[PDB]
A and B are shown apart, each in its own frame.
Chain A
Amino acid sequence: AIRDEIAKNTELSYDFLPLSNIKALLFFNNEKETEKFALERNWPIVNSKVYFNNDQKTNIIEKAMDYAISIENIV
């Protein structure tokens, strides 16, 4: 859980993060597990340089129509 939370945090903050620093950032022990975990999260491993990359209502129409309805229903 700690590792996946840290992965979620790192997916948005760092850009072009070297894998050597990732190995210690994610609290891992050996590089192979770091690469496997990165592949699980679908991060590219180009030259060990991970590049993360990566309903309510209709606007205008619904609001304006509802304002009109509220104005004219009570009249």
Chain B
Amino acid sequence: DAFRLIDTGALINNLEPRQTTSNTGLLNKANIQALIHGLNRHYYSLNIDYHKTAKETKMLMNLHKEQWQSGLKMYDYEEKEESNLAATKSMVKIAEQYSKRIEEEKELTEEELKTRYVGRQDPKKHLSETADETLENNIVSVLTAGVNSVAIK
């Protein structure tokens, strides 16, 4: 946010240089702590409008463009099995915790469930997160394997 000093004795007129001929300046709201140091007392605030250009915004996109030779690169086919086995074991444990959760939920009152899973692993969002993450990783692995097996040959 830019600033520019108040004039001087225009406070005698009390008309700090601000003619509200448009709403475009009044939309911005002065900060709280900024007024503590004095905002409308010594330097009327200004507006800030970053103006872009088609060339610049087109091509700053390149910061999130991966290398072309990385999409078809399958990673080592041992980690993709250890990860699956670990995810399956975690799924088994989380399902057991889900069973005990459902068992315990029968005799709990809402004033506790509103704060029950604050400090302990909620064994439902973990299950959904593990399922979604492993399914996404697995689908990507399948598609990469098949695509390279067909196109590369």
Q: Chain A interface (Cβ within 8 Å of chain B)?
A: 59-61, 63-65, 67-68, 71
List of B residues within 8 angstroms of A61 by Cβ? 143, 146-147, 150
List of A residues within 8 angstroms of B11 by Cβ? none
What are the interface flags for B135-153 relative to A under an 8 Å C-beta threshold, 1 for contact and 0 otherwise? 1000100110111011000
A-B contact count (CB 8 A): 22
Q: Are A64 and B143 in contact (CB under 8 A)?
A: yes
Q: Are A68 and B146 in contact (CB under 8 A)?
A: no
B115: shortest Cβ distance to chain A, in Å? Answer: 30
List of A residues within 8 angstroms of B139 by Cβ? 64, 67-68, 71
15 more contacts with CB within 8 A, not counting A61-B143, A68-B143, are A59-B146, A60-B143, A60-B146, A60-B149, A61-B146, A61-B147, A61-B150, A63-B142, A64-B139, A64-B142, A64-B143, A65-B143, A67-B139, A71-B135, A71-B139
Q: Are B135 and A64 in contact (CB under 8 A)?
A: no
Question: 13 pairs across A/B with beta carbons < 8 Å?
Answer: A59-B146, A60-B142, A60-B145, A60-B146, A61-B150, A63-B142, A64-B142, A64-B143, A64-B146, A67-B139, A68-B139, A68-B143, A71-B139
List of A residues within 8 angstroms of B145 by Cβ? 60
List of A residues within 8 angstroms of B135 by Cβ? 71
Closest A residue to B147 by CB, please name it: A61
B11: shortest Cβ distance to chain A, in Å? Answer: 57
B152: shortest Cβ distance to chain A, in Å? Answer: 13
B74: shortest Cβ distance to chain A, in Å? Answer: 13
Q: Given the complex of chains A and B, what is the CA–CA distance between A56 and B54 in angstroms?
A: 46
Q: Given the complex of chains A and B, what is the CA–CA distance between A65 and B150 in angstroms?
A: 15
List of B residues within 8 angstroms of A68 by Cβ? 139, 143
